[PDB]
Amino acid sequence: STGSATTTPIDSLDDAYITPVQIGTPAQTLNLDFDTGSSDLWVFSSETTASEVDGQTIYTPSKSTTAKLLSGATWSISYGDGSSSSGDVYTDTVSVGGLTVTGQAVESAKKVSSSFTEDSTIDGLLGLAFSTLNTVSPTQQKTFFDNAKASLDSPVFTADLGYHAPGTYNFGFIDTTAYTGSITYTAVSTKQGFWEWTSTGYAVGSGTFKSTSIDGIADTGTTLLYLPATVVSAYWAQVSGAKSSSSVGGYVFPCSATLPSFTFGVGSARIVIPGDYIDFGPISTGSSSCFGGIQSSAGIGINIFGDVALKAAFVVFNGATTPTLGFASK
């Protein structure tokens, strides 16, 4: 089997992407944030504290003939940005882009933090990291991908995120029309539960490539590119007036600037992030200070190849017995 679903930016900045997902019988379609940096499929629901719901579409398990309470199971998750959610668990039928999993754990939120409430466009998350990170207790649950894997034509999914435009998540096949040149595959460590890999270096604009190992995660659920302070300083030094602002919370730059590209290495291959992808616009409406899309990872504890990086590539998440990651230009 295979699946193919379009993913759409939630706003004009590509802060996140939503993908429609069918849950239950008859189908309830919710728009979920596919997150290769976590491993829980959770939804706003009929159980979510009323004051914490503001425009989201909810899953109502009592209206699904295939929903079953997973008795005694609870979940609770905290994300890198400090947001969180928790609740109980149902199993139900879940379909993405025509690919169906029966008995998928659907984690129903009883509580969500303010950032989730405030984002009316995101009805929940669909985790695509390794199932060892799943938070369900006392019986850990598998991700949608893990459950689908054995049925897939090939044990892979691909992320093809758009820059200010829709893109695609495919399951079970590689669309050879969706990228240019060849795909370069690189080793993955699953030791921390992430799609963790080592970039071979970087360049700023038309500058020379610096060969240096940068361990990080491929994370579709993180907006920006978070890299070591040395790398980030070298990038922003090429933008007149750019500075790190503790009050704003990262590097800002004059909105009058033209940003240089940023290249990262994948083996001997190179992915180029155009400068425009690094512009996140005014820090507040009307401001002439703009927020940068490359930020320091210092204090996170890991480097993160988030959407800024991933949307410059066609990315293969290869879930074979020994997982790997592939990157192609597009």
CA distance 28 to 20: 10
Query: What are the structural domains, with CATH classification, of the chain?
Result: 5-174 (2.40.70.10), 175-330 (2.40.70.10)
Cis peptide before 138 (omega within 30 of 0): yes
CA distance 312 to 304: 15
Residue 284 tokens, joined? 């507040």
Residue 193 tokens, joined? 């539960």
Q: Which residues contact 71 (CB under 8 A, 6 or more apart)?
A: none
Give the count of alpha carbons within 13 A of 171, CB side only: 24
Is residue 241 within 8 Å of 254, Cβ to Cβ?
yes
User: Does residue 35 have an active-site annotation?
Assistant: yes
Q: Which residues contact 259 (CB under 8 A, 6 or more apart)?
A: 239, 253, 275, 276, 278, 279
Residues 134-160: b if buried by 16+ CB within 10 A, e if exposed: bbbeeeebbbbbbbbbeebeebbbbbb
CA distance 47 to 43: 10
CA distance 49 to 56: 12
The active-site residue out of 38, 108, 199, 261 is: 199
Answer left, alpha or beta for residue 20, where phi above 0 means left and psi between -120 and 50 means alpha: beta
Residue 145 tokens, joined? 């991908």
Tell me how long the chain is. Answer: 330
SS (H, E, C) the chain: CCEEEEEEECCCCCCCEEEEEEECCCCEEEEEEEECCCCCEEECECCCCHHHCCCCCCECHHHCCCCEEEEEEEEEEECCCCCEEEEEEEEEEEEECCEEEEEEEEEEEEEECHHHHHCCCCCEEEECCCHHHCCCECCCCCCHHHHHHHHCCCCEEEEECCCCCCEEEEECCCCCCCCCCCCEEEECECCCCCCEEEEEEEEECCCCCEEEEEEEEECCCCCCEEECHHHHHHHHCCCCCCEEECCCCEEEEECCCCCCCEEEEECCEEEEECHHHHEEEECCCCCCEEEECEEECCCCCCEEECHHHHCCCEEEEECCCCCEEEEECC
Residues 271-294: b if buried by 16+ CB within 10 A, e if exposed: bebebebbbbeebeeeeebbbbbb
Residue 141 tokens, joined? 């649950």
Q: Which amino acid appears at position 201 of this protein?
A: G
Q: Which residues contact 63 (CB under 8 A, 6 or more apart)?
A: 24, 28
Closest CA to 37 of 216, 251, 182, 235: 216
Q: Which residues contact 233 (CB under 8 A, 6 or more apart)?
A: none
* 89 burial level (CB within 10 Å; 0-12, 13-18, 19+): buried
Q: Structure resolution in Å?
A: 1.2
- Cα separation of the two ends of the chain: 25
At 37, give phi and psi (nearest 5°): -100, 10
CA distance 135 to 133: 6
Closest CA to 252 of 236, 268, 263, 265: 236
CA distance 221 to 37: 6
The active-site residue out of 14, 33, 35, 307 is: 35
Residue 63 tokens, joined? 């209206």
At 49, give phi and psi (nearest 5°): -40, 125
Residues 193-213: b if buried by 16+ CB within 10 A, e if exposed: bbbbbbbbbbbbeeeeebeee
Is residue 5 within 8 Å of 46, Cβ to Cβ?
no
At 30, give phi and psi (nearest 5°): -120, 150
Residue 228 tokens, joined? 């070591």
CA distance 313 to 220: 12
User: Does residue 14 have an active-site annotation?
Assistant: no
Residue 295 tokens, joined? 């930020």
Closest CA to 22 of 57, 73, 68: 57
